Amino acid sequence: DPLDHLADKLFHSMGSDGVYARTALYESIVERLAALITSHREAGTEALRFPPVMSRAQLEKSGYLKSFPNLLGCVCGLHGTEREINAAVSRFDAGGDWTTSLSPADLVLSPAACYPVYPIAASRGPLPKGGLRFDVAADCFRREPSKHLDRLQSFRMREYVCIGTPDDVSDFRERWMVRAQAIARDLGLTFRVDYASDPFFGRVGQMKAVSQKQQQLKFELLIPLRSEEQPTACMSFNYHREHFGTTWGIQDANGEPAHTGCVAFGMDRLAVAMFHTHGTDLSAWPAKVRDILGLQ
Amino acid sequence: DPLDHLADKLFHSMGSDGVYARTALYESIVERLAALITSHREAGTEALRFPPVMSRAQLEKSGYLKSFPNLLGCVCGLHGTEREINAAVSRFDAGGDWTTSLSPADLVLSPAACYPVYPIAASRGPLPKGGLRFDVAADCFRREPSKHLDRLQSFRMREYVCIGTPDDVSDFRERWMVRAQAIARDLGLTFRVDYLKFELLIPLRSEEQPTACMSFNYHREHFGTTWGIQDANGEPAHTGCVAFGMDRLAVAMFHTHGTDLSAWPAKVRDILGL
Ligand SMILES: Nc1ncnc2c1ncn2[C@@H]1O[C@H](COP(=O)(O)OP(=O)(O)OP(=O)(O)O)[C@@H](O)[C@H]1O
Ligand SMILES: Nc1ncnc2c1ncn2[C@@H]1O[C@H](COP(=O)(O)OP(=O)(O)OP(=O)(O)O)[C@@H](O)[C@H]1O
Ligand SMILES: [Mg+2]
Ligand SMILES: [Mg+2]
Ligand SMILES: [Zn+2]
Ligand SMILES: [Zn+2]
C-alpha cells in the first residue's frame, strides 16, 4: 500500500488495526490543521467539544442503527451483583471467559461528531431567523478494522453544523463547498469534489445509497491516497433535510421542522493526506503550506 | 454542591451523568493547562497521544479487571452475519432488544492513559541506562456515573511515565512530586499532598473531602514482568507515572478563580498565555 511507508514516523501499533498511537510529528500536524479550520469559522458559530461517548438512546433515536448497525461501537460492562462480578473475574483468573457477564451500558462510542448537537439545539426552543451554527469535534468510532492508514476504527472528526430553514442549510452548504476547496488548495492537496453516498448497511442500504446519491444529499472532497482510481473521502458535505428536525422536534423561525446540514473534516485523513503529499520532513514542505499552518 | 453553578458556563448535558459537552470557555482552559504541563516536560521525553480505545487483551494483562472490574468500559458490536444484524435491528423496530446480538470486541475504552505504553516500550528491546521517559495522553473512561463535576465517566488524563530501574523511577517520582506542587502553586491553587501512591488534593466540593487532581502511581516491576521489559542490567523493569486530571484541574481553576478569565490573577493569566 502507498501509505504504509508513512507509518514509521506517524504511528505506533496498539495491537489493533486502525487503532494507533500518534507520534509528536503527526500530532503537531493534526493540531495545525485543527487551528486552520478554526480560522475559517464564521461569526456566531457556537463551539462544542464532545467526549468519545454519547447517549445510546439519543443515537438509537437518530436512526443510526437502521443505517450502519455493523459500524456501531456500544459500551459494555459488568453491571451485575458483587457475586456475579467476582465470579466473572474468577473465571478470568482461571483462564476462562469473563466477557459472558458483559451487558450493554446506556452509552455508545460516537460514530459521528454532530449527533449530540441536535438534542442540545432542540432544548433551546424555536430557532432564531438565520438558524443556528455549531462547530463540533469528537473522537469517533466505526467498527471497520483495516490495515490501511486512511481507514481507522478510532479517528477525529471536526464539523461545522447548520440548523435552520432549507435556505439557511443550502446557503451554508454552498459557502462550505467553496471554502473547503480553497482550504485543500491552500494545503497543496490534489482533490475532486463528487456526488456521494453513505455506506448504508445491507440490501436496503443499497437502495438508500442510490436514493441519497441522486437526491445529492452528500458531496465528498476526494484525495488520491492509495490510487487515483479509488481516492479517499477527506471531507463531506451532508444535507439531512428535516430528518433531525423531525426526530428532535427542532422548529424553524417559521415554526416548520428544521432542516440540518454539516461539513465534516476527517482530521486523521487530512493529516495522512498532508504527509503522503508533502512527506515526513516539515522543513521541506512548500512555503505557502508552511505559512498557512503557522510554521516559519 | 459548590461546583454546580459552574456547569452553565462550562458544560452542556448529553443525557448521561459525567458525560458532558465542553463549551469554548472550558476547552480553552483545558488546552492552556495542557500546554503548561508540556512546558515542564524533561529532555528526552517521547510524546505519544493515544485514542479513547486500547487493546482488551493488553488491559486484561495489566491487571485492571482484577482491581476495578465494575469501572471498565468494554467495546461491543454486532459482529454477526448480515441476516443476524438485520434481525437485531428488526427486533428493535418491533419493540424488542437489539443488544442480545452484541458480542465483545478486542477493544476497551482506556481507564488510564499509560496502559498502552508498556507493550510499545517492550517491543524496543532492553532499556538504555537511565531508562525511558514518555509523555502520554488519552480520553479515559471509568463507569462511575455521578452528578458531581469532579467525577466524570469520560475524562482527559495526561501523564509522564518513567520505565527503568527502581532508582530511575524513585528519582523521577521525587522530581515530579516537587514539579507538580510548583505547577499547582503557579496556577494559584490550594492543595495538600497525601496518601505507594501520592495525590495532590484540591478542595472543590468541600475542604473536608478534597479532590485528587494529580497522582503518582508506583507499579513496582508489574509491567516489566508482564511485558518482559528489561532494564540496562537485565532485570525486570520498574515503572512509575505522574497523572494529571485535565478535567479536574480545569474545574479546580474555574472554582478557584471564577468563570471570568479577565479577572484571573496576572501571574496565572501569564503562565497560561492569555
Ligand atoms: N474509518 C475512517 N477512518 C478515518 N477517517 C474516517 C473514517 N470514516 C470517515 N472518516 C472521515 O470522517 C469524515 C466524515 O465521515 P462520513 O460519515 O462522511 O464518512 P464515510 O462516508 O463512511 O467515508 P468512507 O466512504 O471512506 O467510509 C469522512 O469524510 C472522512 O474524512
Ligand atoms: N472519574 C474521574 N473523573 C474525572 N477525573 C478523574 C476521574 N478519576 C480519576 N480522575 C483523574 O485522573 C487522575 C489519575 O487517575 P487515578 O487512577 O490516579 O485516580 P483515582 O485514585 O481513581 O481518583 P479518585 O479517588 O478521585 O477516584 C486523578 O489523579 C484525577 O486527576
Ligand atoms: Mg462509513
Ligand atoms: Mg477512582
Ligand atoms: Zn455530521
Ligand atoms: Zn498511569
DSSP letters, B95-130, are TS-GGGG-EEEEEEE-SSSSTTHHHHHHTT-SPPTT
Top CATH class, A1-296: alpha beta
Burial class (CB in 10 A: 0-12, 13-18, 19+), A285: buried
CB B75 within 8 A of CB B109: yes
Resolution as reported, in Å: 2.5
Ligand 3 mean position, distance from CA A265 (Å): 14
CB A144 within 8 A of CB A155: no
Closest CA to B140 of B105, B107, B106, B112: B112
Cβ of B34 under 8 Å from any chain A Cβ? no
Task: For residue A84, say whether it is annotated as part of any ligand binding site.
Answer: no
Residue B120 zone, left/alpha/beta (φ > 0; ψ -120 to 50; rest): alpha
Extract the C-alpha cell encoding A257. 421542522
Q: How far apart are CA A277 and CA A188, in angstroms?
A: 8
Residue with cell 473512561: B141
CATH code given to domain B1-274: 3.30.930.10
Experimental method of this PDB entry: X-ray
Closest CA to B251 of B177, B149, B162: B149
* Alpha-carbon gap: B21 to the closest alpha carbon of chain A (Å): 5
Strands B132-141 and B45-49, by their bridges, are parallel
Q: Judge if the beta carbon of residue B245 lies within 6 A of ligand 2.
A: yes
- Specify the 3-state DSSP secondary structure of B76: strand
Nearest CA, atom 7, ligand 2: B151
Which of B23, B64, B74 to mutate against chain A (most A CBs within 10 Å)?
B74
* Alpha-carbon gap: B118 to the closest alpha carbon of chain A (Å): 10
Cβ of B115 under 8 Å from any chain A Cβ? no
Question: For chain B, where are the alpha helices, taking DSSP H only?
Answer: 7-10, 24-38, 56-62, 64-67, 82-93, 117-122, 166-186, 222-227, 246-257, 266-271
Q: How far apart are CA A286 and CA A110, in angstroms?
A: 36
Nearest CA, atom 27, ligand 1: A199
Closest CA to A162 of A45, A34, A31: A45
